Structures are given as structure tokens and as C-alpha cells.
């Protein structure tokens, strides 16, 4: 067979230890999921420094805690805009997930609170910014570099899926790089607790699994498809399915055909053909052996999963450190006021926040 006695016993033991870890992690998650933390700071505890990003209902700002001097990333959501954009449930759910999960590659919610006008999520500041910018700048990542990041996503999805959470918005834009070169996943706006199937059309076109495009009920296997897209994009510099308009992207996704750059190793192509598998009865991560088909694949043969989890592997890339509080890895935005009305808005809708 492929393994002698010692190696097979070691692998079996490692896999049993994962089960034991996940069972404890679920117990811890469920306690926080059922009794969420609320109201752990207030706005005047922080100095505003700079806007890191701005979008439909909110903004992310670099802030400094006045007493410790620690920097944080504060997401500010305007309650009235959340209601108008039909995002109440997603907003409450994102905060409930963030305060309940605990994993080294998931961003930590350090404080949360609300006032008359806004909701505030104070998260760790991750100064390397988005993987997206580094990838577009460098062009593509070598296979060992891509593999280092891929391994973190595999472990993070193994964790999330054990909690019955589907993630649904994997892409380089959503992965931040910390000062040690490790990944931080931040955005849980599309995540859902799903033990079986779900039906919502959500995600980003290049990363959508075929079953989402085809308006099927779908499961956590969509995240394993998305991992294939991410690994491909990291190693090639462009995603596997692209075109001028989304409908043409969707035709390519459902076709069952994918082409690879000539520099991809055979091991990488084999892994990707098994992740980017249209047929759900054949897709890695969705078979009887679950995540182990991925973790035990030849492309990951050099990966020490525990050492990745313990953050003991030297990262292949460390973002330029320009001081605690430097913002060079985020874009520049016009600075707008943080208005707090004298009257409470949408109180009932956000009681749980």
C-alpha cells in the first residue's frame, strides 16, 4: 500500500486527534453562540485615525484605544442604511459568528457596541492588508507560497464546517495578511449555519460553484470548490474562469473544463481537478473521507498541519513593517464624519447586537 505500518498509525492517530479537537471546539463555540457578548466598549474609548475602506452601508476605520494605545480596525455600520439595504439578519449574524468563533486564522472581535445611529465592531488590526494587493503586485505566488496559504484555509474550513458554518465568500480580497505572514479571514456577511442544504444566490462570480449558478440546493462543498479557485488564482495570478461579463464566466464554470498554466506541477493540477469538480459525487471535501482527501493529497505531502496551526512555520512573505498603525497596505479614502443622532434609530431591529 502507500504507507507502511508506522506512517499509517501516525496518520490515523493524527486524524483521531483532529476529531477530538473539533469536538471540544464545538462545545466552546456553542456556549458563545447561545450567549453572545454585547456592549464591551464605547466610542469615546477610541481615537479615529484613518478610513481603511468604505462601502454600501459602512466603513472600516483604523482607531487607537486611548488607554492602551493599541490599534484596531473598527467597522461602522449605519443602522438606518442596514435596514434600507435589507441587511439586518446578515449584520446580526456576522457579529454573532465573530464573537463565537475562535481559530488562529479568523479575525478576532475585540469589542462591540452600538449607539443611537451606528453599530460598531472593533476587530484586530491586520496591517499587511489584503492578499489581493500582494498577489496582483507580485503577479503570482510560487507553489510553496500558495501552499502555505492554502493550508491555512483548509484548516479554517475544517474548523468552520465542523460548526456547521458555510463561509461562501472566499477570495483574495477577503484574506488579510498579518505581521507574521499568516492569513486572517474577516468577512462573515455571507456565512450561514447550515447542517444540510441552503439555496441563496450569493458570492463572487469567479468563485461561485456550479451548483450555485444552476440554482440548486447546495452544501459546504461550495467552499471546497472556492478553495480550488483560490489556489489556482494564487499559483497562476489569474482565476480559472474569467470573461468580460459574469454570464460568460458562469458558462465556463458549469462546463466541466479547466485549463492550467504550463508551470503548474502535476500534483497541483491533480488537486485542482478534484476540487474544481462539477460532479458533487466526486468533489474532494464532499466524499466519505471528507477533508482528509485534501489534507492527504500529494500536493500537501510536505505540509505539517500541526505546525501551521501552531504558527511555527516560517512564512514565505512578511509584509513591510512600517510601524504599528501604518496604513500603507490599505487604500486612501476621503474622511467623513461619524454622526451620532440625538434620537435612537432602529432600536428594536438591533436589540441583539
Amino acid at each position: 500500500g502507500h504507507m507502511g505500518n508506522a506512517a499509517a498509525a501516525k496518520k490515523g492517530s493524527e486524524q483521531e486527534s483532529v476529531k477530538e479537537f473539533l469536538a471540544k471546539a464545538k462545545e466552546e463555540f456553542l456556549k458563545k453562540w447561545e450567549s453572545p457578548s454585547q456592549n464591551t466598549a464605547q466610542l469615546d474609548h477610541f481615537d479615529r485615525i484613518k478610513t481603511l475602506g468604505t462601502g454600501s452601508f459602512g466603513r472600516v476605520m483604523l482607531v487607537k484605544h486611548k488607554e492602551t494605545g493599541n490599534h484596531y480596525a473598527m467597522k461602522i455600520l449605519d443602522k438606518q442604511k442596514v435596514v434600507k439595504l435589507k441587511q439586518i439578519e446578515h449584520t446580526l449574524n456576522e457579529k454573532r459568528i465573530l464573537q463565537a468563533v475562535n481559530f488562529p486564522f479568523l479575525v478576532k472581535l475585540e469589542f462591540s457596541f452600538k449607539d443611537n445611529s451606528n453599530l460598531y465592531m472593533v476587530m484586530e488590526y491586520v496591517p499587511g492588508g489584503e492578499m489581493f494587493s500582494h498577489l496582483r503586485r507580485i503577479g503570482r505566488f510560487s507553489e510553496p507560497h500558495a501552499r502555505f496559504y492554502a493550508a491555512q484555509i483548509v484548516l479554517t474550513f475544517e474548523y468552520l464546517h465542523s460548526l456547521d458554518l458555510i463561509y461562501r465568500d472566499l477570495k483574495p480580497e477577503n484574506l488579510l495578511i498579518d505581521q507574521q505572514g499568516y492569513i486572517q479571514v474577516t468577512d462573515f456577511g455571507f456565512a450561514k449555519r447550515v447542517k444540510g442544504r441552503t439555496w441563496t444566490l450569493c458570492g463572487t462570480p469567479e468563485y461561485l460553484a456550479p451548483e450555485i449558478i444552476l440554482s440548486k440546493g447546495y452544501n459546504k462543498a461550495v467552499d471546497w470548490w472556492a478553495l480550488g479557485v483560490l489556489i489556482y488564482e494564487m499559483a497562476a495570478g489569474y482565476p480559472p474562469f474569467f470573461a468580460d461579463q459574469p454570464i460568460q464566466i458562469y458558462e465556463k464554470i458549469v462546463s466541466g473544463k479547466v485549463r492550467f498554466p504550463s508551470h503548474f506541477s502535476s500534483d497541483l493540477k491533480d488537486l485542482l481537478r478534484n476540487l474544481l469538480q462539477v460532479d458533487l459525487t466526486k468533489r474532494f471535501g464532499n466524499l466519505k473521507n471528507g477533508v482528509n482527501d485534501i489534507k492527504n493529497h500529494k500536493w500537501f505531502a510536505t505540509t505539517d498541519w500541526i505546525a501551521i496551526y501552531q504558527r511555527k512555520v516560517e512564512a514565505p512573505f512578511i509584509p513591510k513593517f512600517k510601524g504599528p498603525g501604518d496604513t500603507s497596505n490599505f487604500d486612501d479614502y476621503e474622511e467623513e464624519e461619524i454622526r451620532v443622532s440625538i434620537n435612537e434609530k432602529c432600536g428594536k431591529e438591533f436589540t441583539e447586537f
Partner: peptide, 18 residues
């Protein structure tokens, strides 16, 4: 080439969700 096709797609920047 595939890379040139990617540039031509106009989808090299940050991508929005559906």
C-alpha cells in the same frame, strides 16, 4: 495568451459580490 485575456476581461481589480 491567457494572461492577456485576463487583462482584456476588465476584471483584474477588486471584485464585488453578487
Amino acid at each position: 495568451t491567457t494572461y492577456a485575456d485576463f487583462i482584456a476581461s476588465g476584471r483584474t481589480g477588486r471584485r464585488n459580490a453578487i
